[PDB]
Design a protein around this ligand. Structure first.
Ligand SMILES: Cc1ccc(C[n+]2csc(CCOP(=O)(O)OP(=O)([O-])O)c2C)c(N)n1
Ligand SMILES: Cc1ccc(C[n+]2csc(CCOP(=O)(O)OP(=O)([O-])O)c2C)c(N)n1
Ligand SMILES: [Ca+2]
Ligand SMILES: [Ca+2]
Lengths: 678, 678
């Protein structure tokens, strides 16, 4: 039952955001001015502790339409999160805590958004993650998980394919606790939606299996908005979209125009806004005491009280079910089981050749029993990626009869970009969820919006990217990565492992799974690769190490993945013509660059020509070698030995090229490429 | 009305496509078998000439589920295209005309497909270019343009978000002549569709404004399928989707399973299939002469007659409408207007500072009327990207009141991947279509599935990517490109132009528009750059040039875009304390790499340290530079000059690093990075 204070709360949210943008002299005022009533009605009714933004059973809210940040920054300040008027008075400025689009790093901001389509897709991970937790640990008497995931979205997020991929899957899985509120404002940047987007959203979403409710006066009807949220909460086995119509820039002297989407309202427009809302035209960043006190009784103090009850029931649970309690307690502290690493496989050069892909499968076989928080899947490639262990149970709705929500194998369908973002949402949930998803390395490029954000936020998701080159063969150039790794190695904060054998696969799994702030790509072979004499988890964990040494070498050859063996063989050949060649295995650029310089310079020393061997683009290699043998053109369709042969990657093709490199440089002094001037 | 020969032709396609997979012992047999009837029936009513596969008014066929290619090669053979049983007998083998997934470059293959969701979105572009040709050239009595676009597709294509962006825009544009038949086989790789895809496709499609017809028996109802395509051709204002149900692998002992998705059938199963259809189990690649006779009659001879009447008519047309007939003949021979290049703007250093973004807009305004084949557009950032000339009309249904199909400016919505595949479809249509699309440089990444195929197939599409660096400012890290250029510079066959001033934006445009086979990305500044002294179109068209030279440079500074003015200022600092810098402006890696080595070595010689200056990733720069100053971490939200200073990119901060580069190398002899050893 909304009184005049609820109407005072809504004008302070709108004008605070107006103020924020106008001081910054930059930012988007329009959606904050129209979404403010929905923010007030929703937040007031979400169960959350502002003093503990990390309580696992907190309701989660994602602002998918990240450009509306000043609405999230006002709410965060007013409902009592650590963020202040001074923070806000520095919206969009160098160094401040208030950047131009929300970032995971701030408290009460759940994932970073700004790229459209990302927030709504992350929220689907969050709801899958709650569905899984609740299923795993809730016991009759102890309902430790039952929260909701509220999403805010625009027309933009409904146009991007990722949210149609995500929504299709959310609908399949029956994710009842996911509630999206669509700001139907009939405007985006170029103008009116009818110029390019006139589909029937509601019918589109009901087709997916979502329930759709409507609110027609979202600009003033707090009860309407209120009853929709409440009806949505009864939708136990359908996600809900609430389509709430609003006017962009409500109150503004140019509301409904598209000029109010991303520029500060002008001075005189803001003053009439203050007068009309009963605020003073010449005062800014003003919060009535009545608003703090309101949210203090409405949210902060029940939230703390709710958080506090949770703690006591969790402790009776650790008494009642000591080992499940022990498990959840660990995940919540964010440590992995002690000494889990002992279940990782090791091999010698005595055991068989095996594609790095079937070795990948053996890690998953050996570790899932040890790490309950490891939840995996595939974007329809399960038998190609070898990404599901034998005793698994699929994550499905219980009605399906194929699996249930305790299951740990997500079937993603042909939805890469969606799986990238759903993986980020499962990881941003907490309780130590280790998400992975497989596909073919060539199609991880589809997911690139989502993967740049696993890197910007630091979400340790794992991509199991199999079929990593022309050794795919006959599927041809549409399915053969050329530029893929080079790309992702130019992206700050992401591990790109390309293992050469069994020990190096175990080191890629170990470092990826132990990571707390870097995502990983494990690039894996379709084809059989031999076990190497002298690979080791320990050594490959440094990301780059001398695999085969000689005294006073003529050349250093550096290879990644399937080219390490080819380089060892070319190394025998160079030896018989009396050339000493050192073979270096660089499984991950990132991890090796995290090494201390004096390590790096023992692996890639001065005064020795250094040549790289890798069947993908040579563009990222100048930082480790002097001359590079790689492929800077698309591949080809044929038997895989023949495509390798057709491009030169043969032991005598590498040896020839090492010889031409020794010859080119005899007499010159050579500096290591690692060394920089400044 | 179909007869016995129509059923013999359908068995001949079934078994010929099976013998092609089994021969390769690699491939996908299932969708060939189940889809053979719709192929027979659809192709028999297409108007096409096997003899002339480039006839502008041919009905166009796209197979979007590209893995089903054994079938597209069976029909191209059978209907008289240049492909023999021999070519069929080296399917998937190194260097044959039969790749494991179709490539644009083959006669009768329209676009490269195989990546899911790419076919359908390209077919939307091809229907947009048809509608634009028809409204621009069709006259009373002269219907030079009226073809249909047909697309085969499957479950995989429907789950990729790019076909949902594409279908939405298509429904908005009311593209009546685009007819999609979907293989509703209830199987994908992982198993049944219900394990993760059980949305109501039909209701979803009606939501976009598409008409949906249903063929309950695709397996044998020739009459029904024909009815459906006939009905489909009546609706001029709805694109049509035919949900046709089939059994994957019809006629196989394991028909209806995911086993027959991508494995050659078992020999014993191939034998029974052949007996089952009246063929000899012991013979291969058998084609009844009645089948050959049948298609020569129903498809090739009609086809050749249609092409001949079309020609007669186009000759009358150029008598009746000279200009228009000369223009369409020019566009049809692929030539640009003569001397179009002279309408491009030149500037001197006495001209004013302008962002290269505004300067792009003035090229577009100065050449759109010279080039009627130029069709522009943005993905909802028209006022940011500055992509629209003034007098433009938008490409809309006539029914809209906002344009008609003679419009040349498209409002793509917030659909970037789909803009990508659609500009590839427009280019692939012919008539010298020159599509260009605007977005933010950081979000071209959203469209990587399509940008890769632009380069593999060689469709010379232009992306106008404004807002290239931390000069974007206050929106910060989510919107500032870090790795984007080093990604597309590692892609074979794409210009990535990053012009520093007007004369370089003109050169970028000239080189991109003359291109017949290589796409282009032009990265542009949000912020004001000045007009350099030393640029010119001629120099800038070589891709790397010496902007200012000195006799005997102590250092060469290689820079691109907003950093070339910075480097010319750093060079003024250095001069003052008598270091001689040569400043090299490198606007495109591709075009420069294409120069004669003699030219490149006169730009980047031996025996001088070369330091590169660019505010994005340094990884790619090892090929031209000894030391590189750039950003290998994400950005910051702040006013742009402040963010540049934070990162060190000031005149004196560049000068300073040049000084440490000189001092690091003094007394080493240096070899230009361009010199390769093999
Ligand atoms: C992936 C992507 C592309 C381009 C943009 C730029 N952009 C920001 S909002 C928007 C569309 C505005 O529509 P909206 O969600 O309906 O916003 P509103 O507040 O209603 O005006 C665009 C294109 C981006 N942030 N993310
Ligand atoms: C972007 C993308 C990712 C992954 C694949 C690999 N792939 C090809 S078909 C298929 C999905 C099952 O496809 P379908 O269209 O239902 O075909 P059918 O022949 O009906 O089984 C998979 C995952 C692809 N070609 N492109
Ligand atoms: Ca909007
Ligand atoms: Ca299928």
């Amino acid at each position: 039952q909304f009184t005049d204070i609820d109407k005072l709360a809504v004008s302070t949210i709108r004008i605070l955001a107006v103020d924020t943008v106008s001081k910054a002299n930059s930012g988007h005022p329009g959606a904050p001015l129209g979404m403010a009533p929905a923010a007030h009605v929703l937040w007031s009714q979400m169960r959350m502790n502002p003093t503990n933004p990390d309580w696992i059973n907190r309701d989660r809210f994602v602002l998918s339409n990240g450009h509306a940040v000043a609405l999230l920054y006002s709410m965060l300040h007013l409902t009592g999160y650590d963020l202040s008027i001074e923070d806000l008075k520095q919206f969009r400025q160098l160094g401040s805590r208030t950047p131009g689009h929300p970032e995971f790093e701030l408290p009460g901001v759940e994932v970073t958004t700004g790229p459209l389509g990302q927030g709504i897709s992350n929220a689907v991970g969050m709801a899958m993650a709650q569905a899984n937790l609740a299923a795993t640990y809730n016991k009759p008497g102890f309902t430790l998980s039952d929260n909701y995931t509220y999403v805010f979205l625009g027309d933009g997020c409904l146009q991007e394919g990722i949210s149609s991929e995500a929504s299709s899957l959310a609908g399949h899985l029956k994710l009842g606790n996911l509630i999206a509120i669509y700001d139907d404002n009939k405007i985006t940047i170029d103008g009116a939606t009818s110029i390019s987007f006139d589909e029937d959203v509601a019918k589109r979403y009901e087709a997916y299996g979502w329930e759709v409710l409507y609110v027609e006066n979202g600009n003033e009807d707090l009860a309407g908005i209120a009853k929709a949220i409440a009806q949505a909460k009864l939708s136990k086995d359908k996600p809900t979209l609430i389509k709430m119509t609003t006017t962009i820039g409500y109150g503004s002297l140019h509301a409904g125009s598209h000029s109010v989407h991303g520029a500060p309202l002008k001075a005189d427009d803001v003053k009439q806004l203050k007068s009309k809302f009963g605020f003073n035209p010449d005062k800014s960043f003003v919060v009535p005491q009545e608003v703090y006190d309101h949210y203090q009784k409405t949210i902060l103090k029940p939230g703390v009280e709710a958080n506090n009850k949770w703690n006591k029931l969790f402790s009776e649970y650790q008494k009642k079910f000591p080992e499940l309690g022990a498990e959840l307690a660990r995940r919540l502290s964010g440590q992995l089981p002690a000494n889990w690493e002992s279940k990782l496989p090791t091999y010698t050069a005595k055991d068989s050749a095996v594609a790095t892909r079937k070795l990948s499968e053996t890690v998953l076989e050996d570790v899932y029993n040890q790490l309950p928080e490891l939840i995996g899947g595939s974007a329809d490639l399960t038998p190609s990626n070898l990404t599901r262990w034998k005793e698994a149970l699929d994550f499905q709705p219980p009605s399906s009869g194929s699996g249930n929500y305790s299951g740990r194998y997500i079937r993603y369908g042909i939805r890469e970009h969606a799986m990238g973002a759903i993986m980020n949402g499962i990881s941003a949930f907490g309780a130590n969820y280790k998400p992975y998803g497989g596909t073919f390395l060539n199609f991880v490029s589809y997911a690139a919006g989502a993967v740049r954000l696993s890197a910007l936020s630091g979400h340790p998701v794992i991509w199991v990217a199999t079929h990593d080159s022309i050794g795919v063969g006959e599927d041809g150039p549409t399915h053969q990565p050329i530029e893929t790794l080079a790309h992702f190695r130019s992206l700050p904060n992401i591990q790109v492992w390309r293992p050469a054998d069994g020990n190096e696969v175990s080191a890629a799994y170990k470092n990826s799974l132990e990571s707390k702030h870097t995502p990983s790509i494990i690039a894996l072979s379709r084809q059989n690769l031999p076990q190497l004499e002298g690979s080791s988890i320990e050594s490959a964990s440094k990301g780059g190490y001398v695999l085969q040494d000689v005294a006073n070498p003529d050349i250093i050859l550096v290879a990644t993945g399937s080219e390490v063996s080819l380089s060892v063989e070319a190394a025998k050949t160079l030896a018989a013509k009396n050339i000493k060649a050192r073979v270096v295995s660089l499984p991950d650029f990132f991890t090796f660059d995290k090494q201390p310089l004096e390590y790096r310079l023992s692996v890639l020393p001065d005064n020795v020509p250094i040549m790289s061997v890798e069947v993908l683009a040579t563009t990222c290699w100048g930082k480790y070698a002097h001359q590079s043998f790689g492929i800077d053109r698309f591949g080809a369709s044929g038997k895989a030995p023949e495509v390798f042969k057709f491009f030169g990657f043969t032991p005598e093709g590498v040896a020839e090229r090492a010889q031409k490199t020794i010859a080119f440089y005899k007499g010159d002094k050579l500096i290591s490429p690692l060394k920089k001037a400044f």
